[PDB]
Amino acid sequence: NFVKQLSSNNRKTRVNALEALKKYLTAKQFKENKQIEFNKLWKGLYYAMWFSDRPRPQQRLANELGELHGLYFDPKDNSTADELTTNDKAFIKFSRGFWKVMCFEWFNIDRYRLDKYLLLIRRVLFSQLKYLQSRNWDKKLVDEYIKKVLRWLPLSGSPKVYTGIPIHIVDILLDEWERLLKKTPLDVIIFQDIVADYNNSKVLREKIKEDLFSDTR
Amino acid sequence: HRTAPKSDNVYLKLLVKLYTFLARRTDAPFNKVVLKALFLSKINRPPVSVSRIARALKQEGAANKTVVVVGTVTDDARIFEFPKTTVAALRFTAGARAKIVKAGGECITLDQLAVRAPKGQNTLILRGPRN
Amino acid sequence: SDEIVWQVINQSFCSHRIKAPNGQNFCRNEYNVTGLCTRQSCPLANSKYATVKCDNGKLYLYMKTPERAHTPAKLWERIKLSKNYTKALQQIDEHLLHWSK
Amino acid sequence: EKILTPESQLKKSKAQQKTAEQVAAERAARKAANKEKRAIILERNA
Amino acid sequence: SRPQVTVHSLTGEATANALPLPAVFSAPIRPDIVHTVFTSVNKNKRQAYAVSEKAGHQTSAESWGTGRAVARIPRVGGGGTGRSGQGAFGNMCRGGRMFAPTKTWRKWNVKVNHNEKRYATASAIAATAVASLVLARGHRVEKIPEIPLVVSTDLESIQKTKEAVAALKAVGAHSDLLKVLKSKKLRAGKGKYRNRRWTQRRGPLVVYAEDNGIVKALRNVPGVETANVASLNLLQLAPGAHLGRFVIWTEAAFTKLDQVWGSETVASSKVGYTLPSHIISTSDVTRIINSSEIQSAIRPAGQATQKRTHVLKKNPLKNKQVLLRLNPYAKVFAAEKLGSKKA
RNA sequence: AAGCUCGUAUCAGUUUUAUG
RNA sequence: CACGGACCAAGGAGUCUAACGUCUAUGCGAGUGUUUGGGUGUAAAACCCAUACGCGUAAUGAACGAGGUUGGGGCCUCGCAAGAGGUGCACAAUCGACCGAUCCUGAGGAUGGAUUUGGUAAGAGCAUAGCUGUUGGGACCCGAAAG
């Protein structure tokens, strides 16, 4: 099992597990399984990242792990005029598993390892909004992706999800968006509904009002 | 005049420092109340039954308000229609934990509540009967 | 966790603790930088640690990270300081990038 | 490759800068208020 | 789940196998509970000691009473032997009955709740998985390949002591073994002549699922102790009410620990018992306090040390400098010489 | 000594005033 | 004023136990108490409990309805603040009801009147450990005519 190998203490085996998984990810006609397999794979990747601490190499591991999101059926099929090509669904499931694993293990990260996971989240969010279509210029797929994103991270209605991840997402949203290099489908600014709707964490509402909206961009 | 707790538990001491830090750096009365209650002895911290929590939930806007119990939550066999709510307490009995989880609710610790409500956002404090 | 370990070593008979007449607690651990058993000074209670040691005349920069907490055998990653005060200090500063003051 | 600053450190720096701007504004306001109050006290004493 | 622990062969080379955490090491660590349980358990191996009842009362004596200009303490009768006229029947008298003679029915054993004992044992076992905590216990675990240490099941089958000690040395336990046999010192005090002459530091602990000769093989080597997963004695686990003993586990023992101490999947392997639940989800407070959520809704801090203000009082009416700070009209008064104003 | 309700209008080895 | 003190080395006195309690901490919690014993054992050491047993869990039908108002540590809205509004644990007053019954009555004891009764309305106890109070045991130590 990849998850068992990805969490292996030995560094060589851990790296080889990811190297082999680079192909298992693109192994077609096998990602149709339920989201539980994606959740298990991302749980294994969580420990795989956990086993790296040094700044320079951990950044390399984080970026190569974030590239896994784009590894899924790179934008070479030219699936224009298709609501779902059966490949973007795999990417959506992968992102959902990533967010579920990160949300569940948010408080299991020590103080020193928190920066590593913040960097990993930043890299994953960069790979997202970079690989939906060729880039984030697809309404028919952004509506599905935003629906599967709006319902978990920015919900702010269920206190089960910690408010730190939404705060980091708010902080890095505009920073990462400018990296893509415009009139992009930015329905994303969800935050208006969060501010309008009560019952949410007042800290989150204040942070988004003071920082996100106040931004000149 | 209560300043510090007599309990030797390390986890209780960590919770006490967290609550003191929140109270001193937030000036929110909710944190002060819980910090003061943490120093109360076992007798002064009677358990709060799950039936008592369900009865307290009958007030308006209970779904949007979480319930916080300084003491320990004990199961009750006289009630079965337990609503879905988040309960935070130092300890949860096996029966009470099963009842809360079975009814779709979630049980969390004091630190989880503090991170979810640094200033007591929609937090309800229940005190068990003294005698 | 570090906090649990920190409490377990503050009280509860930490192995290396010297009760000086002045009341100061001195730590005899070789890896300690100050030699005192206090917070952010005891390597055992700190996941991240940095210290300077030397077997021969060469001086090394011993550092610890949470990565090797599961492998006590090779916890520390010593790096030679290329003995020279100015360049050694520059190398120490470069190595301890973004570390605590 | 270049080592990037910690995200927590970046947030701390941003918060420090934002608080320092307000601190400087408050210092300027306090200086102006002190000058005005000194003038008021001088006239009151006279 | 939680990370997995690899298995090291007798040669010391890591094996291409790993096992899931039994979840026992994730139990809360409560030094107070362990210390309280140990203080009562150590008293179990106590033998009753008392003074002879006939002591003191054997002597025959009577009180002379007033009129003799002497202490009214009872004195021995007779004569010629010298003992006559000597005081007796009193703790203040030589050879007399001691005040409050010790009696055999003193409370020796202490009853301890079974759940408290289980909690203490679980905490002691969990403390063994922390290298820093084990190091603070004084064990030389600085050169162990991994913690907790798990060895292949073939270790339990070793019969000769030489092979067992060689295997222990090969897995980084040589330092711990050498720690013993070097601290051997004569007993300090009156215990040298009460079958307590020699004392030594505790050695490594070896845990096995089943015994095939390892217990006899390691019996002779000083310091080293052997125990079964079922028992897991608290006294051996945490000698002197101290957490974090160096324990060398085995693959079979590691696998059987899940059953013995229970987990989320296996219910308890015991009658109506479950592992204790933490009252706090996170055992670390630095991450929580420094969390984004808390920091976002926290007022700005100070300088970490209050600046001294008005350390010394500057008395006006002198030192014009301070006088000009207050009453800014002082400059006008002095310049205009208003004090000597003329009608 | 512990608990709850709390900071007030709870009071005074004081004075005047008012009712007498 | 009275009783001790010629000087010095050692000894010398709120110590143990059974019962009933307050406070404190732990484990569980409407359940709790492994150790009278058996299994087991590196052997008075360490680990587990099939049935019993001590305590509590239900008053003098508890849903008339597991109760309505006034306050109430707290929470939310408005408000720069002052303050205003909505909701409120424990706990207090009030409105009251009830389990069983008084004080009478009078279809053998139903029905109807007059007062109130001690408490429920939605458990808090078990065992362990520390200072500590009372009683009996030589009882903080010696000494009182004696059968």
From Swiss-Prot, chain A:
The keyword Nucleotide-binding does not apply. It comes from the Eukaryota. Its main location: nucleus. The keyword Acetylation applies. Signal peptide: none annotated. GO terms for cellular component: nucleolus; nucleus; preribosome, large subunit precursor; preribosome, small subunit precursor. InterPro entries: RRP1. Required for 27S rRNA processing to 25S and 5.8S. This is Ribosomal RNA-processing protein 1. It comes from Saccharomyces cerevisiae (strain ATCC 204508 / S288c). The lineage of its organism: Eukaryota, Fungi, Dikarya, Ascomycota, Saccharomycotina.
Curated annotation (Swiss-Prot), chain B:
There is a cross-link at residue 102 (Glycyl lysine isopeptide (Lys-Gly) (interchain with G-Cter in ubiquitin)). One of its GO terms (biological process) is cytoplasmic translation. The modification N6,N6,N6-trimethyllysine is found at residue 36. Keywords: Cytoplasm, Isopeptide bond, Methylation, Ribonucleoprotein, Ribosomal protein, Ubl conjugation. One of its GO terms (cellular component) is cytosolic large ribosomal subunit. It comes from the Eukaryota. It is found in: Cytoplasm. GO terms for molecular function: RNA binding; structural constituent of ribosome. Component of the ribosome, a large ribonucleoprotein complex responsible for the synthesis of proteins in the cell. The small ribosomal subunit (SSU) binds messenger RNAs (mRNAs) and translates the encoded message by selecting cognate aminoacyl-transfer RNA (tRNA) molecules. The large subunit (LSU) contains the ribosomal catalytic site termed the peptidyl transferase center (PTC), which catalyzes the formation of peptide bonds, thereby polymerizing the amino acids delivered by tRNAs into a polypeptide chain. There are 2 genes for eL18 in yeast. Belongs to the eukaryotic ribosomal protein eL18 family. Component of the large ribosomal subunit (LSU). Mature yeast ribosomes consist of a small (40S) and a large (60S) subunit. The 40S small subunit contains 1 molecule of ribosomal RNA (18S rRNA) and 33 different proteins (encoded by 57 genes). The large 60S subunit contains 3 rRNA molecules (25S, 5.8S and 5S rRNA) and 46 different proteins (encoded by 81 genes). eL18 interacts with NAP1. This is Large ribosomal subunit protein eL18A.
Swiss-Prot record, chain C:
Keywords: Cell cycle, Nucleus, Repeat. Its main location: nucleus. It is found in: Nucleus. It comes from the Eukaryota. One of its GO terms (cellular component) is nucleolus. GO terms for biological process: maturation of 5.8S rRNA; maturation of 5.8S rRNA from tricistronic rRNA transcript (SSU-rRNA, 5.8S rRNA, LSU-rRNA); maturation of LSU-rRNA; maturation of LSU-rRNA from tricistronic rRNA transcript (SSU-rRNA, 5.8S rRNA, LSU-rRNA); ribosomal large subunit biogenesis. The keyword Signal does not apply. The keyword Nucleus applies. Belongs to the MAK16 family. Its role might be as part of the apparatus concerned with the nuclear events of the cell cycle. This is Protein MAK16. It comes from Saccharomyces cerevisiae (strain ATCC 204508 / S288c) (Baker's yeast). The lineage of its organism: Eukaryota, Fungi, Dikarya, Ascomycota, Saccharomycotina. The gene is MAK16.
Curated annotation (Swiss-Prot), chain E:
The modification N-acetylserine is found at residue 1. Changing residue 318 to A: Significantly diminished nuclear localization. The gene is RPL4A. Belongs to the universal ribosomal protein uL4 family. It comes from Saccharomyces cerevisiae (strain ATCC 204508 / S288c). N-terminally acetylated by acetyltransferase NatA. Its main location: cytoplasm. The keyword Acetylation applies. This is Large ribosomal subunit protein uL4A. GO terms for molecular function: RNA binding; structural constituent of ribosome. SUPFAM superfamilies: Ribosomal protein L4. Transmembrane segments: none annotated. InterPro entries: Ribos_uL4_C_dom, Ribosomal_uL4, Ribosomal_uL4_dom_sf, Ribosomal_uL4_euk/arc_CS, Ribosomal_uL4_euk/arch. Changing residue 331 to E: Leads to an inefficient release from ACL4 with a delayed assembly into the 60S subunit. Keywords: Acetylation, Cytoplasm, Methylation, Nucleus, Ribonucleoprotein, Ribosomal protein, RNA-binding. The lineage of its organism: Eukaryota, Fungi, Dikarya, Ascomycota, Saccharomycotina. One of its GO terms (cellular component) is nucleus. The eukaryote-specific C-terminal extension harbors a nuclear import signal and delivers the ACL4-uL4/RPL4 complex to the pre-ribosome, triggering uL4 release from ACL4 and incorporation into the 60S ribosomal subunit. The modification Omega-N-methylarginine is found at residue 94. The keyword Acetylation applies. It is found in: Cytoplasm; Nucleus. There are 2 genes for uL4 in yeast. Gene3D superfamilies: 3.40.1370.10. Residues 276-343 are annotated as: C-terminal-extended nuclear localization signal. It holds the Pfam family Ribosomal_L4.
